[PDB]
């Protein structure tokens, strides 16, 4: 028998973010740790998408209760609300802030040390501070917008058949002339082709950022702006676009154009019809299921918390992945059903400036709940070696899932997929 003040401790000390968000509304109320409550709701707020709720907590917490909470635990909670405040837009205050910590850790004799990565925040938000943050106008109504839904054509050299899955094409207009964009949940932030940013006039704001993994924008180093954008009578302002030259992943397919996370993280609620090949951004959102919020957010990454046969898996949201596929770490964990089952086969892909071949493992088929829907992926990826990335998800869910049901709905505001 635990009091309040244990059991929220224990939520975070596992990283059981679903646990902690579950759980501390009621538990709230028994605390009397108030730092400890502080410290929840500003994880709270990062991880299920409440940003001004972290913000505030974070400060509370760094006026009222540093000497308690320890000198690492300040800094962490004050680098956190940086980067909180740079994915909310607020470029002024997170490259002002980041600034003032690297100098006080400069002070210290701290920043050779674990934090020199804070160095590109700052460089990174230094180069945004007299920029808008990202915006939409739009009139209040459900907003049904026409896509297409296309097979991703790839070179027979590398896919037989000439195509691998499919995207997601939602049309946008800029200037006048009207184009295909890729709708990626997956992209941290849009993205343009070196071509794309020339033809559409984008306003390049940098060439000489450090590629950063988790900074929505330092993807290739150059990114840049474009003050108007339209998508039906959704008018999108001051994008962040991650502009990419040509690199040896055009080998395998050229991408031009990719609407992503600074438009999509606007919206309470998404909802694709795939069969009919339509969008709704919705007036009023989807009540949350049954089954409760099964979104994280991780920086721009949207985390679905799915079950297989029992297990819990933790699949990365990506609709710019064109199937779907599980990680080395998942591999590992059912090793011996996957290679009596599984069918060994070479596959070619990559990304920017990367093209790989490897051995994967096929699964003839896979069976995952979603919330109270189960989705049947059928010739399922699955690394059978560590893919060059620090594990963490067990998966990558895209296409493959969204294709067979008639209304997947993304919900933001309230953290949940719903498949119908």
Known sequence: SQSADERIGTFLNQA????????????????????????????????????????????????????????????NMAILACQIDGLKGNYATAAQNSRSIMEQLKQQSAEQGMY?????????????????????????????????????KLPTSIEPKGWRGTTILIPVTINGKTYQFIFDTGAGTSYMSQRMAKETGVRILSDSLVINSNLPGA??????????????????????????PPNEFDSIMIVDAVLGMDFIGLFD??????????????????????????????????????????????????????????????????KAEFESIGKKEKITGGGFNHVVTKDILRLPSFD?????????????????????????????????????????????????????
């Open 16 to 75: 059981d973010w679903f646990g902690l968000e579950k759980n501390y509304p009621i538990l709230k109320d028994s605390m009397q740790a108030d730092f400890l409550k502080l410290m929840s709701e500003a994880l709270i707020g990062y991880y299920f998408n409440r940003p001004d709720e972290a913000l505030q907590s974070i400060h509370k917490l760094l006026v009222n209760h540093q000497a308690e909470i320890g000198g690492q635990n300040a800094l």
């Open 116 to 152: 020199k990565s804070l160095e590109g925040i700052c460089y990174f938000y230094d180069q945004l501070k007299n920029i808008p943050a990202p915006g939409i106008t739009c009139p209040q109504e459900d907003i049904i917008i026409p896509v297409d839904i296309e097979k991703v």
């Open 219 to 244: 993807m290739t180093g150059n990114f840049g702006t474009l003050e108007n954008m339209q998508i039906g009578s959704i008018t999108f302002h001051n994008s962040l676009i991650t502009i990419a």
């Open 269 to 334: 609620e998404v909802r694709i019809y795939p069969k009919d090949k339509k969008i709704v951004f919705p007036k009023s959102s989807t009540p949350l299921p049954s089954y409760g919020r099964n979104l994280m957010k991780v920086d721009r990454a949207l985390k679905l918390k799915a079950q297989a046969n029992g297990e819990t898996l933790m699949l990365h949201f990506d609709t710019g992945n064109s199937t779907a596929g599980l990680f080395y770490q998942y591999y590992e964990k059912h």
């Open 368 to 420: 995952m709940e979603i919330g109270d829907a189960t989705a049947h992926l059928k010739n399922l990826a699955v690394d059978i070696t560590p893919n060059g990335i620090p594990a963490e998800d067990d998966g990558n869910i895209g296409m493959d899932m969204i294709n067979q049901f008639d209304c997947v709905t993304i919900n933001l505001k309230d953290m949940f997929l719903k498949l119908e």
